Design a binder for these strands. Structure first.
Ligand code: HPA
Ligand code: HPA
Lengths: 338, 338
DNA sequence: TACGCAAACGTTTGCGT
DNA sequence: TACGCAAACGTTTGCGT
């Protein structure tokens, strides 16, 4: 069709091209003439044709886990913002923690020739680390690890341990000594690592959380419901709960309510993520905030780098979590003795 | 690179192609040989090269409004599921109700040559109806209108009016006669149309909602907070509130709480959307459920049709909302007199 | 029986003059 | 000064034999 444009215009397609991408000087007269064509002809320059030549699609892929999840969801909208303002196109893909599903999108992606690869897989088994590294050729960053798992990728790191530690600390310094925890999947950084940070702060205070007081969640409100229920539903119960993430928290909240307990009056609860509307939880949720936005833009940024600046060596950037005091927490029994 | 494969293999690229797409018979012997190459050579067939020939990208675009929003978010994850299982690639794009932003992605999209176009723009001014129809050439469906605005598109329709009406009805039949409403943007179906459905049921009962009892929200919890606050914060207040959508509802909830009112003890409240975790709202939210999933798959489906079956005429499919009774509502003063 | 020749898809870009 | 010739990018596919 570029051939058609050049013809109504009586100029080479070579010309037509040039004006369309201001890649060389063209007489005004001519320049206009081209547009004239472009417009009546109702011309849309084929990006694939062009991609085929110039060798780059100007499009990138999000090999994510799932997008409905609050946490996720926000991280994405960010990444998207950055793609846009920097001309990039977004290819969203959810593997649902499914190897086959991953090997698939991974491939679809390579074939579709995405310029770089954004990776958010949550769990990362050897089997996955492997597939991932057969595409080391395509530039990519994994935006969800705690430490730098491989050498063939860039990494953004959240310090979800210092976060877990802040979480504990707060409770500790609030009067609390009988604490419970519902962590996320241990096969996940935001899961395991958060917990760990929490437990250190605890050992440091010689608080010993009883195993009957620690219940695994899956980051989904239902898991939160069940956990909290399991906790409060027992002879002896803590006065404070640390919840692996805000939506589970939102779950934990409900159940405590359905069991007629008061938050934070009867049970204090602190979560983690600082999700968009945790402030409208009831009560307004006190949590640890994860800089999802920065996390996103910081990821785009590294990728872009490797991309244009053709960087080879790996990189890793740390991002930092911070306490947000809302109102789901209250002074514990030992506050006055400190 | 296909040329490279055919060479290690000592066969025509023509061959190589054929085996890769089982498009004609190839001697086993040969067939294997090819793979052999494909594999060591570590070959990934270029989809763009191929797209250039076969004329179809096998990829589709979501010209959406925003993706973090609960409602939205879910609709998307659906659409994505369907793209995947049907080989399609997803291009997510948020125009944020910004014309320029829209004219942009719209174009990026056409140039990128998406096979069909999924449209979810929320507000739709003439200026937008126009741009949209300059791409009538690219197959597309708008999955967010109440009636069929244009003739150059397919349409999935939600009956958000029958929904608004159900909403009212419930309240009516529960003992309620002093009702309030926080609707979504009137420039939106889920906004206006829901309201309307609500108001009819009201006129039908000769309930007259006082204008000081109806407050616009923007579908965001903060708007909900403010509205509810505005309502309950006044001499005379209703005994029941209909909330244009679940997250705003979640907002309305909080504020009522911060004003020491009880839900549904002091104020009954019913929302709309039936968002993924409205069950974990506190109290468990009673709302109108919107079949987002079906809405999604139903959209993919129509598009696919036009796409493969090269359908020209427009179509429109209706989907239906339904009452979900949770516990944010209680019998009003007139329940016994019915 | 089983496979190749070669032109085409829609652009970009180096050497021209 | 201001523009074209023509080959190339990586595939697919019709006519062959
Ligand atoms: O894996 C996760 N899923 C959902 N929310 C989360 N917040 C932290 N990690 C996660
Ligand atoms: O426009 C909307 N935004 C967010 N949630 C919604 N639920 C219905 N309509 C909307």
């Amino acid at each position: 069709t570029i051939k058609d444009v050049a013809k109504r215009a009586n100029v080479s397609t070579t010309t037509v091209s040039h004006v369309i991408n201001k890649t060389r000087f063209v007489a005004e007269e001519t320049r206009n003439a081209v547009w004239a064509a472009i417009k009546e002809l109702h011309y849309s320059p084929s990006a694939v044709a062009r991609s085929l030549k110039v060798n780059h699609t100007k499009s990138i892929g999000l090999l994510a886990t799932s997008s409905e999840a609050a946490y996720f969801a926000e991280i994405i909208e960010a990444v998207e913002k950055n793609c846009f303002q920097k001309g990039y196109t977004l290819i969203l893909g959810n593997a649902w923690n499914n190897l086959e599903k991953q090997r698939a999108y991974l491939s679809m992606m390579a074939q579709k020739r995405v310029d770089g690869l954004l990776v958010m897989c949550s769990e990362y088994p050897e089997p996955l680390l492997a597939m991932l590294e057969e595409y080391r050729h395509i530039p990519m960053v994994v935006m969800d690890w705690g430490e730098a798992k491989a050498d063939f990728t860039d990494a953004v790191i959240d310090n979800a341990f210092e976060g877990g530690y802040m979480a504990g600390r707060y409770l500790i310094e609030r009067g609390h000594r009988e604490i419970g925890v519902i962590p996320g999947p241990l096969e996940r950084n935001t899961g395991a690592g958060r917990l760990a940070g929490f437990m250190k702060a605890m050992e440091e205070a010689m608080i010993k959380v009883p195993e009957s007081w620690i219940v695994q969640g899956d980051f989904e409100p239902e898991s939160g419901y069940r956990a909290m229920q399991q906790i409060l539903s027992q002879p002896h119960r803590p006065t404070a709960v640390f919840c692996g993430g805000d939506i589970m928290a939102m779950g934990a909240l409900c159940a405590a309510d359905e069991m007629g307990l008061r938050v934070p009056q009867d049970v204090s609860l602190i979560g983690y993520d600082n999700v968009r509307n945790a402030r409208y939880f009831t009560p307004a949720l006190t949590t640890i905030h994860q800089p999802k936005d920065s996390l996103g833009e910081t990821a785009f940024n590294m990728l872009l780098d490797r991309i244009v600046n053709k960087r080879e060596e790996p990189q890793s950037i740390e991002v930092h979590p911070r306490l947000i005091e809302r109102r789901s927490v209250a002074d514990g029994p030992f506050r006055d003795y400190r």
